[model samples]
Target: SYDIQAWKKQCEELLNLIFQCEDSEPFRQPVDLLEYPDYRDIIDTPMDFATVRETLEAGNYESPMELCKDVRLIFSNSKAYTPSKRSRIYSMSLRLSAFFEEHISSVLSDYKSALRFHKRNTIT
Candidate 1:
């Protein structure tokens, strides 16, 4: 069985890493509709680091993938809203998304291997 607490801890660690990135500032909080009036019009669903952190604290995510989806949404929304790769927001989104994907992939595989090991030991 998956360890929920362990998963939550890992997710928290990942969030800390994301928080350290300078490019993460814009994504730290939800987009202000006042500044970008069209943000809500183009982005059907908005996601941010703060929201993800709160969701994790509230135990809203049942699996790592669920958390991953929300995390990815933050960058995807940025890209979708901006649509210009040359824009600062779009570039930052790409960089942060790449960093997140690389780290999360390893974290996921680590959990998968641990689960496999657990299965092997239990089956004997």
Candidate 2:
């Protein structure tokens, strides 16, 4: 379960960035961005975590802007860096997601390795 408050805080932070970069990423800076509720169910939109799940399920997002658009529309309402030029959100989305996933996986793998070493060297 997502902590609504925590996610909202994160969303707010992201929106601020969008506002600052709207000249670049206008699509990410929707008109009613600040007005959206934390749950965003007025439009029955899925939350951030769910949006990520949707991305993997769809497996058709092509550009960074497209990916960002889908995700921001679905969950963020309006929150992300709008590049000064428009092209695709899918690329950014995929790259960002892959970066995070790879980083997390690497850390977890290292943690598992450390745990194994600790266990093997444990004193009786």
Candidate 3:
């Protein structure tokens, strides 16, 4: 429970820091649901906004699927850190084309899974 509490507290603090007003009550006011836990049910949820911007600023993709590769890459980094969004994004992404519809996360997911190895120690 301590670990969960610590993480929850950290999350709450980050949210407050991101949106606190100079004269507003901190943690005493409600965080707009849109700002707190982002509503991703919308087809155009801004969750992927930053990455899309990064990809476009880099001038890589001319279309959505072309950008799909960059999206998966960003997802990998995000998933490593964003456990909450991991399952939701992965589930939805896997419903897409070969570019996204895969197990671990990307086309690399299959390749990595196929090559995964286990190591043994003397302890059980």
Candidate 4:
């Protein structure tokens, strides 16, 4: 459970940091949800908030894991900017897209499937 604990702690820290900046004017600008596959639950919940910061702050994530899921969902479908909201400020960004890509790619493609060997490995 160490890995889960670490993930939760990281989420809490990041949320807190972002919450502190919730007061900025740009934080209220509306941006498209652009939800991920099966990530519609959070979208329904955040319908009341216009900006990412407010949505994140207002969303009542039962646990850090829940919050982490939404964060991943958002980053994976990176689209912080929208056509109608071009000139306005917002609290969304794809700054962590590459970060998540690298971090998320470190693991195998399938956890419950057969193993695959690289070309460099010794062949019988």
Candidate 5:
């Protein structure tokens, strides 16, 4: 079973990364509600993980893969950024879901290969 607390911690880490990118990525300012009205709710939505699962469910997400697709689609639907360069939240969700697929889903059978994949795709 997944550890809820650990998942929350990782989520919080990603939130902080997305929220506090002033130094790392100066152009990634807090999304402007005026320019991107579609993302307003998500920008202000609660950060609770349980709420997200329910939110995904209500959005017709049956499996975890669906969850990630729709979540990424949320950013895609928004006109805030170019389709090529989605918002941090979009990228974060994709990355986290990939992590889940590899580690939790056991998509990668070899532990060393998983570590290599993680190192290549994500920051240390």
Candidate 6:
């Protein structure tokens, strides 16, 4: 069984780190349709940090992977909307996505280790 409480705590910590990134500004809130009128046309789904935080607080995620999917959506949406590699939003998306993946990998590794420990303890 998954230790959901521990996973949630780790997710919160990861979110805090993402929040501190300078490139996180554009992704902090829902994209303003007034500003990018065609954003909705190209991007089928939209996501942002604020919505992710709300979902986390509401305990909507069943696992760390679910939360990670939404978090990744924020960047993928940006990349899809801003095709130009030189665009600030596009570049930020790449950087922040890499940052998130790196940290999340470690978090997942720790989770696996904990599971191993629990399984061994339960058997003995």
By lDDT rank, best first, the candidates go 1, 6, 5, 2, 4, 3
Q: Give TM per candidate.
A: 0.85, 0.30, 0.24, 0.32, 0.29, 0.85
Which of candidates 1 and 5 is the stronger one according to TM-score?
1
Residue by residue across 1-124, what tens digits does model 1's lDDT show? Answer: 3543477788899999999999899999989999999888899999999999999999888767888999889988987888577999889889999999988886676677667766877856
Between 4 and 5, whose TM-score is larger? 4
Better of 2 and 3 by TM-score: 2
Worst 10 residues of 3 by lDDT: 1-10
For candidate 5, the per-residue lDDT at 116 reads 56
Backbone clash numbers for all candidates listed = 0, 19, 0, 0, 0, 0
**Could you report the Cα RMSD, in angstroms, for every candidate shown?**
2.8, 13.0, 18.0, 10.5, 12.0, 2.8
lDDT of 3 at 48: 42
Note the Cα lDDT for every prediction shown: 0.85, 0.40, 0.37, 0.38, 0.42, 0.85
Off by over 4 Å in 5: 22-71, 78-124
Better of 3 and 4 by lDDT: 4
Residues 38-73 of candidate 2: C-alpha lDDT, one tens digit per residue:
424444543343344445346554323344455545
Tens digit of lDDT per residue, candidate 5, span 44-65? Answer: 4323333444554455443344
Estimate, for each residue in 3-108, the C-alpha lDDT of model 4 and write its tens digit: 3224333444454554444332223233334534443533443321133334445655434444445545453332333334332332243333344344433222
* Candidate 6 local distance difference test against the native: 0.85
Error of 2 at 77 (Å): 11
Q: Comparing 1 and 2 by TM-score, which wins?
A: 1
lDDT of 5 at 7: 33
